[PDB]
Amino acid sequence: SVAHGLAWSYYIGYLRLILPELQARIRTYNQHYNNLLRGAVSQRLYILLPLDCGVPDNLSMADPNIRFLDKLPQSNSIYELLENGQRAGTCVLEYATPLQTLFAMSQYSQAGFSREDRLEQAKLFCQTLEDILADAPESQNNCRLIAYQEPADDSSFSLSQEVLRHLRQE
Amino acid sequence: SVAHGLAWSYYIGYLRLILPELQARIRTYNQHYNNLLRGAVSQRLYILLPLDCGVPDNLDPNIRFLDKLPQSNSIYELLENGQRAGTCVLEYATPLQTLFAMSQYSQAGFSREDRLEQAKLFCQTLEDILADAPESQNNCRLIAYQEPSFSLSQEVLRHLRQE
Ligand SMILES: COc1ccc([C@@H]2[C@@H](C(=O)O)c3ccccc3C(=O)N2c2ccc(C(C)(C)C)cc2)cc1
Ligand SMILES: COc1ccc([C@@H]2[C@@H](C(=O)O)c3ccccc3C(=O)N2c2ccc(C(C)(C)C)cc2)cc1
Ligand SMILES: [Ca+2]
């Protein structure tokens, strides 16, 4: 049942506060700070929600097709996404950082929290957060959760492709 | 049921990480930075848990900021009878802000009664995690309270004297 508190704190202490000014920050960046000869940053906050709760310290180390470009002024980061070796999209991207509690609990023997318990709580965190965001006034076509289970076959999943599928739905 | 996730995250993402080096940080302060007469900073981390979930933006005239704890934690002096009666590392259990904000958000369907119950369960769950945790070695004290004038300094001093 840890997922409920994780989802509510993440929304009420972070997403609720950053989503209202996000569009204005992206528009300011695109007009005044972005380099001339490249794409504009897309408008939504893209949140990576790996169901395995594996949150890396560097997105480029997780996928070489996701490259840091800049900080979004006014901490959020802009990345370029590659496909077939070329630039395919630019967006504000980050992980659902409360998943780190679920990961750490699965590694702490006193929690009595298995990998199966972790997966169940990650799914509940995603479901609860989606329900909150659906009813939230701050979420106005400006946030997208990217929840994913990684197949056993490495070749059948690309993190950059997962973000690109959502970005192309804009 | 939000209290469980709040307690586990607060422990596993913060208390578990800061409690092992806390007493060394307090010893550094007491030996090299503390210039008060018999004002050694107490050894434990004191965590304010207002059961009403009211966390102010800056931590009572009898509680006065002294310094940042080197190596963000803050040291305060506690006054009693107008004089310094103790010094400690003091801070709020910041996850209570989720419970307060939920009670202020109609779509959460979370009443003041639900809030109080979750604040008490957060305190109990956190105390139990800390009791079984290898990082809490007589170094973290939870100060849970409710208002009846209330004196926050008197609440902290009771726990300081218990150390
Ligand atoms: C003061 O006590 C805390 C406790 C936890 C957090 C963050 C923070 C986040 O960055 O998302 C968060 C917010 C809401 C719910 C859960 C978490 C969470 O899981 N945190 C966290 C938890 C664990 C980690 C390590 C295991 C990598 C160290 C890193 C980050 C921050 C302050
Ligand atoms: C990235 O997403 C987050 C979400 C929440 C937090 C912190 C953070 C804390 O400072 O204790 C925390 C950790 C673990 C569980 C809960 C909370 C929590 O309740 N937070 C919080 C929640 C709400 C507030 C306002 C309502 C005053 C703005 C302020 C702080 C930080 C990052
Ligand atoms: Ca594999």
Swiss-Prot record, chain A:
- Where found, per UniProt? Endoplasmic reticulum membrane; Cytoplasm, Perinuclear region; Endoplasmic reticulum-Golgi intermediate compartment membrane; Golgi apparatus membrane
A GO molecular function term, named singly, is: protein serine/threonine kinase binding
List the residue ranges of the region (Cyclic dinucleotide-binding domain (CBD)): 2-170
**Spans within the Cytoplasmic topological domain:** 2-170
Q: Sites of the modification Phosphoserine?
A: S75
Listed result of changing G13S: Slight decrease in c-di-GMP-binding
Cite the effect that the entry attributes to R118S: Found in a 9-month-old patient who died following a fever and severe neck abscess without indication of any severe bacterial infection; likely pathogenic; may affect splicing; constitutively active mutant that promotes the production of type I interferon in absence of cyclic dinucleotide ligand; localizes to the perinuclear region in absence of cyclic dinucleotide ligand
Summarize what the UniProt record says about post-translational modification: Phosphorylation by TBK1 leads to activation and production of IFN-beta. The phosphorylated pLxIS motif constitutes an IRF3-binding motif, leading to recruitment of the transcription factor IRF3 to induce type-I interferons and other cytokines. The phosphorylated pLxIS motif facilitates SENP2 recruitment during late phase of viral infection. Phosphorylated on tyrosine residues upon MHC-II aggregation. Ubiquitinated.
List the GO cellular component terms.
Answer: autophagosome; autophagosome membrane; ciliary basal body; cilium; cytoplasmic vesicle membrane; cytosol; endoplasmic reticulum membrane; endoplasmic reticulum-Golgi intermediate compartment membrane
What residues bind 2',3'-cGAMP, as annotated?
Answer: S9, Y14, T97
Q: Which residues bind 3',3'-c-di-GMP?
A: S9, Y14, T97
User: How the protein is affected by changing P98A?
Assistant: Strong decrease in c-di-GMP-binding
Residue positions binding 2',3'-cUAMP: Y14, T97
Q: What result follows from mutating T101A?
A: Strong decrease in c-di-GMP-binding
Chief location: endoplasmic reticulum
Q: What is the effect of changing V2M?
A: In SAVI; constitutively active mutant that promotes the production of type I interferon in absence of cGAMP ligand
Q: What is the effect of changing S9A?
A: Slight decrease in c-di-GMP-binding. Renders the enzyme sensitive to 5,6-dimethylxanthenone 4-acetic acid (DMXAA) drug, leading to activation of the STING1 pathway
Protein family? Belongs to the STING family.
The entry's function note states: Facilitator of innate immune signaling that acts as a sensor of cytosolic DNA from bacteria and viruses and promotes the production of type I interferon (IFN-alpha and IFN-beta). Innate immune response is triggered in response to non-CpG double-stranded DNA from viruses and bacteria delivered to the cytoplasm. Acts by binding cyclic dinucleotides: recognizes and binds cyclic di-GMP (c-di-GMP), a second messenger produced by bacteria, cyclic UMP-AMP (2',3'-cUAMP), and cyclic GMP-AMP (cGAMP), a messenger produced by CGAS in response to DNA virus in the cytosol.
Subunit text: Homotetramer; in presence of cyclic nucleotide (c-di-GMP or cGAMP), forms tetramers and higher-order oligomers through side-by-side packing. Interacts (when phosphorylated) with IRF3; following activation and phosphorylation on the pLxIS motif by TBK1, recruits IRF3. Interacts with RIGI, MAVS and SSR2. Interacts with RNF5 and TRIM56. Interacts with TBK1; when homodimer, leading to subsequent production of IFN-beta.
What disease association does UniProt give? STING-associated vasculopathy, infantile-onset: An autoinflammatory disease characterized by early-onset systemic inflammation and cutaneous vasculopathy, resulting in severe skin lesions. Violaceous, scaling lesions of fingers, toes, nose, cheeks and ears progress to acral necrosis in most of the patients. Some patients have severe interstitial lung disease.
Designated name of the protein: Stimulator of interferon genes protein
This protein's species is Homo sapiens
Covered part of the full sequence, start to end and full length, is 155 to 336 of 379
